[PDB]
Amino acid sequence: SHMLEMIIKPRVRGFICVTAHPTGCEANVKKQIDYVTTEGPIANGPKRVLVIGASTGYGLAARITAAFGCGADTLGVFFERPGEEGKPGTSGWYNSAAFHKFAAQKGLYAKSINGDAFSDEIKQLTIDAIKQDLGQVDQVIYSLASPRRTHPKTGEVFNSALKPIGNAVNLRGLDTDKEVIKESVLQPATQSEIDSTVAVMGGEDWQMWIDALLDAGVLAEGAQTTAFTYLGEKITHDIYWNGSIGAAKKDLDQKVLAIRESLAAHGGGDARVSVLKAVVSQASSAIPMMPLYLSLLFKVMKEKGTHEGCIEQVYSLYKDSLCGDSPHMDQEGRLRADYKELDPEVQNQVQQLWDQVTNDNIYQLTDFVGYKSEFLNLFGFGIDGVDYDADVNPDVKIPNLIQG
């Protein structure tokens, strides 16, 4: 059986960790669950939840909160690679395998669909799943993060860009491989790259989802949907909020209105763009700015007692705003969970440290240690009480997994 099993260690290829540890991912999922159950149940939550992008990061945390905080039956959709012999699957695959296992232990429904959520096919499989099992869903979480989209009608492949708009920008960053503070310049996005980014990360596909569920009649009265967004501090504004990715996020703000209008006449349902804080994710070393900003932010927020990851954010988002008696609303009608990051004193401290960090003082000025630990945690590595010396079978299976 040693030929079918292997010792799995991190392998970092060009800022991407290309391995994932199944036992560690299970431990990470369990830790997120134990957080939710320790904090306690959430009153008045949805009971039948569809999460689009349910295998990692914020969508995973939404699934865990819905299931183990609100007691929801959950249907998840994601796009992940199964493990095979000699070849660890993606962290999201192992995460979902662990979710299904823990859901069943607690007697909660868990079914998942692995495939392209941008396609009509997957929307159909999802509809069919709800009809057979749930009747309808009360809540739809939209949490896809993707670099590309195949348009379901036209077949066109759109690619997102992470560029400023207008002028080129100098962005200070941390190269996590060489452990050097260094700057690079990004050229402004072309109108074409802006439209492509809005096609991928804007709100059309979210619309196509809520319309497809409606046209099939699988949405309960008083239903609710939310898509996640990031606004960030002024230091991220040039590249994020006012760049190509921010153009996409602003498209979401123009989608959420037609969404809310349709659900509000439908038993007083509701729809909101929800704004969340920056966290370490699979794509954090997309641009070396993110690791530097996270390392700084983690240190500052830890000194204030306010540091959080995905599960802490989404638990509050559900308890305070999605299901709570005091929604934390902004001037635009967005739900906000990100205010501890945007606190003026935090921004100021992060901004002051930003111009001071050098190769020599990274560990004295920042929580780069913490960034690295959370980044490895995502793939199931560096976790407490996991025996990393033991052989493991990378081919972990998932019951009630529809493969599309």
Please spell the DSSP secondary structure of 122-182, one letter per residue: HHHHHHHHHHHHTS-EEEEEE----SEEE-TTT--EEE----BSSS-EEEEEEETTTTEEE
Residue 61 one-letter amino acid: A
| 281 touches ligand NAI by CB under 6 A | yes
Judge residue 226's burial from the number of C-beta atoms within 10 Å of its C-beta, 0-12 exposed, 13-18 middle, 19 or more buried: buried
How many whole angstroms from its chain centre is CA 201? 13
**The one catalytic residue among 240, 293, 318, 371:** 240
Sequence-separated (6 or more) residues with CB below 8 Å from residue 219: 136, 137, 140, 210, 213, 263, 266, 269
| 74 touches ligand NAI by CB under 6 A | no
Half-sphere exposure at residue 118, Cβ-oriented, CA atoms within 13 angstroms: 23
Calpha distance 105→64 (Å, rounded): 14
Calpha distance 64→101 (Å, rounded): 12
- Which entry of ligand AEW, ligand NAI, Na ion, none binds 256, CB below 5 to 8 A by partner kind? none
| 278 touches ligand AEW by CB under 6 A | yes
Q: In the range 107-136, which residues lie near ligand AEW by CB under 6 A?
A: none
Q: Site for Na ion (CB under 5 A): which residue of 23, 74, 112, 143?
A: 143
Q: Count residues binding Na ion (CB under 5 A).
A: 5
| 146 touches ligand NAI by CB under 6 A | yes
Q: Site for ligand AEW (CB under 6 A): which residue of 62, 174, 290, 386?
A: 290
CB closer to Na ion out of 227 and 256: 227
Q: In the range 336-395, which residues lie near ligand NAI by CB under 6 A?
A: none
Q: Site for ligand AEW (CB under 6 A): which residue of 55, 91, 160, 196?
A: 160
Helix (H, G, I), strand (E, B) or coil at 61: helix
Judge residue 166's burial from the number of C-beta atoms within 10 Å of its C-beta, 0-12 exposed, 13-18 middle, 19 or more buried: exposed
| 46 touches Na ion by CB under 5 A | no
| 145 touches ligand AEW by CB under 6 A | yes
Calpha distance 152→134 (Å, rounded): 26
| 58 touches Na ion by CB under 5 A | yes
Stretch that binds Na ion, among 47-55, 345-353, 372-380, 393-401 (CB under 5 A): 47-55
- Which entry of ligand AEW, ligand NAI, Na ion, none binds 118, CB below 5 to 8 A by partner kind? ligand NAI
| 283 touches ligand AEW by CB under 6 A | yes
Q: Site for ligand NAI (CB under 6 A): which residue of 143, 262, 316, 349?
A: 143
Are the C-beta atoms of residues 46 and 72 closer than 8 Å to each other? yes
CB of 177 to ligand NAI, least distance (A): 20
Helix (H, G, I), strand (E, B) or coil at 369: helix
CB of 163 to ligand AEW, least distance (A): 10
Are the C-beta atoms of residues 197 and 252 closer than 8 Å to each other? no
Please spell the DSSP secondary structure of 268-300, one letter per residue: S-EEEEEE------TTGGGSTHHHHHHHHHHHH
CB closer to ligand NAI out of 58 and 371: 58
> Could you give the string, one character per residue 211-230, with x where binding to ligand NAI holds by CB under 6 A and - elsewhere?
-----------------xxx
Q: Catalytic residue at 318?
A: no
Calpha distance 301→63 (Å, rounded): 26
Sequence-separated (6 or more) residues with CB below 8 Å from residue 325: none
- Which entry of ligand NAI, ligand AEW, Na ion, none binds 402, CB below 5 to 8 A by partner kind? none
Q: Site for ligand AEW (CB under 6 A): which residue of 68, 293, 315, 318?
A: 293
| 145 touches ligand NAI by CB under 6 A | yes
CB closer to ligand NAI out of 23 and 96: 96
Active site residues: 240
Binding site for ligand AEW (CB under 6 A): 145, 147, 160, 162, 230, 232, 236, 240, 245, 278, 281, 283, 286, 289-290, 293
Binding site for Na ion (CB under 5 A): 53, 57-59, 143
Binding site for ligand NAI (CB under 6 A): 53-59, 77-80, 92, 116-118, 143-146, 228-230, 276, 278-279, 281-282
